[PDB]
Unconditional design. Structure first.
Length: 25
């Protein structure tokens, strides 16, 4: 994914720059 295999304190598949687009569609 993107937060997949990374820290998660703030990080989500969404806060990423070009994120896993499930946090939209």
């Amino acid at each position: 994914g993107c937060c997949g295999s990374y820290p998660n304190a703030a990080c989500h598949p969404c806060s990423c720059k070009d994120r896993p687009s499930y946090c939209g569609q």
